[PDB]
């Protein structure tokens, strides 16, 4: 017998509908398309973004980010994948990670949990890589779970927590920033030349602390470049950002005349231009919905830290341009701030930033997506968004905090035989 040895590349329509729902600061997978080496991929996601009904009228738009990343399988199975491709037909089948027995416990990967409880490891691992390289704060430790079953029900069902949009309190300098540096000197002399050197080393430290915690950044610093293969990072193909809005619904009965309900319907469109897939992998598309971090009790630093010194009030450039990072507490910027919770700020930061003001009349008023009490906890707990901080904002519904109905138009120019080349023996 002679067999159908070739195939000619033709457009494959892998389009599908997406019925989505998530929480406010959690990263969730909304679509995934497995890709073959050599195919060309393009997508047009067009749908509507809705928030759960809110308790009063619209006050603030939320921002939406949609991302499409490419994760080669090699990146996920390493050596094992390489060998699989080489071994070919009799390669040992690929490893499968374990989920918790519930229908929504793999939802973070945008999938229904199979009854067996396992999924392809590349689906779980790709997600972790995406999170650890673009979403955790550079200084937090990577998420290193071996199987989805190690996750809480909120991480598993809704996706991992993302950081807030940058603030003085939301984006402090990295935890271990040094506020001083000693040079061991001799008892009655200092080496003028060693001192010089001392400064050169701290420099190098300081840069890694503030801008280069990641290997890829250290190289760019040298003016070199590093491939996504060099540090195994998911490649960001496309990203769309938008503000979702809508309209208020006027109540009209005897008791609710003078009352409104904000309806957020936002038409959006996520377009990924054609992309050449160099090796077999998954194409992950994720969504993140967030509100600006408006707390109902943030104070202006100068208004809440006692008596004002010359250094704090004068705006003297020689001072600000030359002294160490300032360690501050949650109490210097918040009404119920824990004085025990510290953070390092740049000197003069208070003159480079302005907090939003929420009159005290709004403090526990439901229907506003404001953070009601200052985040309590370690630096990490304060920068990671907590979806419950938004519970009193919406009407209670089964579709969490936001829901979307999208049409994923996706075309892949792949080269596999026709469905009938496939079902015909000859």
């Amino acid at each position: 017998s002679n067999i159908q040895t070739g195939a000619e590349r033709m457009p494959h329509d892998l389009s599908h509908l997406g019925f989505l729902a998530g929480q406010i600061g959690r990263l969730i997978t909304i679509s995934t398309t497995p890709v073959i080496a050599g195919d060309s991929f393009e997508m047009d996601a067009v749908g509507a973004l809705r928030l759960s009904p809110l308790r009063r009228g619209l006050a603030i738009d939320s921002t939406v980010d949609i991302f499409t990343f490419y994760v080669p399988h090699r990146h996920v199975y390493g050596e094992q994948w390489i060998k699989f491709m080489k071994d070919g037909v009799n390669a040992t089948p690929l490893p499968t990670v374990n989920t918790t027995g519930y229908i929504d416990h793999a939802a973070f990967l945008g999938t229904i949990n199979p009854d067996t409880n396992k999924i392809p490891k590349h689906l779980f691992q790709g997600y972790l890589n995406i999170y650890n390289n673009y979403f955790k704060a550079p200084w937090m430790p990577d998420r290193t779970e071996a199987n989805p079953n190690e996750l809480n029900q909120d991480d598993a069902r809704y996706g991992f927590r993302c950081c807030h949009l940058k603030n003085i309190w939301t984006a402090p300098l990295p935890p271990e920033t040094e506020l001083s540096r000693q040079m061991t000197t001799s008892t009655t002399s200092i080496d003028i030349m060693g001192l010089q050197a001392a400064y050169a080393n701290l420099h190098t430290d300081q840069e890694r602390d503030y801008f280069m915690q990641r290997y890829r950044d250290v190289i760019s610093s040298f003016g070199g470049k590093t491939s996504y293969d060099a540090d195994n990072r998911p490649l960001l193909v496309m990203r769309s950002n938008l503000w979702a809005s809508g309209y208020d619904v006027d109540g009209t009965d005897q008791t609710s005349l003078g009352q409104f309900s904000g309806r957020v319907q936002q038409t959006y469109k996520h377009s990924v231009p054609r992309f050449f897939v160099p090796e077999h992998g998954t194409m992950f598309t994720l969504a993140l919905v967030r509100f600006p971090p408006t707390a109902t009790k943030e104070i202006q630093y100068l208004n809440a830290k006692g008596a004002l010194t010359y250094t704090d009030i004068a705006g003297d450039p020689v001072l600000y341009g030359n002294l160490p990072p300032r360690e501050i507490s949650m109490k210097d910027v918040f009404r119920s701030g824990d004085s025990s919770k510290k953070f390092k700020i740049a000197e003069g930061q208070w003159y480079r930033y302005a907090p939003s003001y929420v009159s005290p009349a709004y403090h526990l008023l439901e229907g506003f997506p404001f953070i009601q009490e200052p985040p309590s906890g370690d630096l990490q707990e304060r920068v990671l968004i907590r979806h419950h901080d938004y519970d009193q904002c919406f009407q209670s519904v089964q579709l969490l905090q936001w829901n979307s109905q999208v049409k994923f138009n996706v075309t892949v120019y792949r080269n596999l035989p026709t469905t009938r080349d496939s079902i015909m023996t000859s």
Binding site: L49, I66, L236, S240, L242, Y268, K269, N409, V410, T411
Partner: protein
Amino acid sequence: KGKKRSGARPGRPQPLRGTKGKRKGARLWYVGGQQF
């Protein structure tokens, strides 16, 4: 690599009309004949 964001598609939402892509290609279903 990623870039400009655009869900700013100014419009009232439209009910999802059809799960079949934009550009199709060869035939996918074989059922023994025509089936409406």
